[PDB]
């Protein structure tokens, strides 16, 4: 494959987390890298291409309780409840496709690492009316 790792040099934060799927609600262990207003995740630390990319545009973070996983938080859009979060993930053949998430539920290995991740992600959110403008205009004419 291609080594794309210059993209991830000197990140804001990195670490292992468990994440819940979009349509199919399965948990997966993923290596996350937060950098340049994007949250990336990988299957293995040795991967040179991301499994997923989440541009951090007008998202918020909330603590949630989960019956089976500890130290959970969610990424969500407060202004457009129920609307799909922009993201992409890689299919088996390497083709990038759009994500299906309305939220990203994530479990951290300790409450300390949860706090670190929430603080870091909040600091890295790109906030701008532009994103809300796009969502609103798109929804008005979607067919």
């Amino acid at each position: 494959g291609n080594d794309l790792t210059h993209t991830f040099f000197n990140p804001d934060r990195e670490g292992w987390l468990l994440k819940l799927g979009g349509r199919v609600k399965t948990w997966k262990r993923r290596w996350f890298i937060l950098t340049d207003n994007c949250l990336y995740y990988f299957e293995y630390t040795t991967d040179k291409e991301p499994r997923g990319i989440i541009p951090l545009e007008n998202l918020s973070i909330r603590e949630v309780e989960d019956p089976r996983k500890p130290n959970c938080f969610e990424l969500y859009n407060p202004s457009h409840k129920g609307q799909v979060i922009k993201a992409c993930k890689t299919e088996a053949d390497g083709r990038v496709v759009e994500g299906n998430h309305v939220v990203y539920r994530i479990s951290a290995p300790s409450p300390e690492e949860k706090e670190e991740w929430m603080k870091s992600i909040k600091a890295s959110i790109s906030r701008d009316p532009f994103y809300d403008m796009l969502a609103t205009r798109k929804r008005r004419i979607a067919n």
Binding site: L4, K86, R137, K138
Partner: protein, 163 residues
């Protein structure tokens, strides 16, 4: 009809403006794209799935990630930016020489034609080193993304040339 499109180019070239002019029928005031935008646009019986990837320096090593499955490349250039045209040329050829991009037809949007002294399509053809490339299917479409001039013409070319 269906077509997967990858839209690339230097930061500030006009990629996102073009995307939403097509998707929303209107010129919007953009901000720099930190990751990507993706939209599906129906135009004259073809659905174009368009991936607009951020063109900032730091993001470019990630462009290769988006190659797989690409059927058409749209490469957008700021025609008023003579300081960075050679940089745009270098990036374009890196893209089209990639093993995953060998079959992609190439649409160049020679964008910002509204600006004084903006490079014309014939100059862009020369400056992007397209004249040498005689074994690929490419076209330089003059455009002004903010007025919409040339955008439908570009999509028309894609439909006409995609095999």
């Amino acid at each position: 009809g269906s077509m997967r499109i990858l839209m690339l180019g230097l930061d500030a070239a006009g990629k996102t403006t073009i995307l939403y002019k097509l998707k929303l029928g209107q010129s919007v005031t953009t901000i720099p794209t930190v990751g990507f935008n993706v939209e599906t646009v129906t135009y004259k019986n073809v659905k174009f799935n368009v991936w607009d990837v951020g063109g900032l320096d730091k993001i470019r090593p990630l462009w290769r990630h988006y190659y797989t499955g690409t059927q058409g490349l749209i490469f957008v250039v700021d025609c008023a930016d003579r300081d960075r045209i050679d940089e745009a040329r270098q990036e374009l050829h890196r893209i089209i020489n990639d093993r995953e991009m060998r079959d992609a037809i190439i649409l160049i949007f020679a964008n910002k034609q509204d600006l004084p002294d903006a490079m014309k399509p014939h100059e862009i053809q020369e400056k992007l080193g397209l004249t040498r490339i005689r074994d690929r299917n490419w076209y330089v479409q003059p455009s002004c993304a903010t007025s919409g001039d040339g955008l439908y013409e570009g999509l028309t070319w894609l439909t006409s040339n995609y095999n």
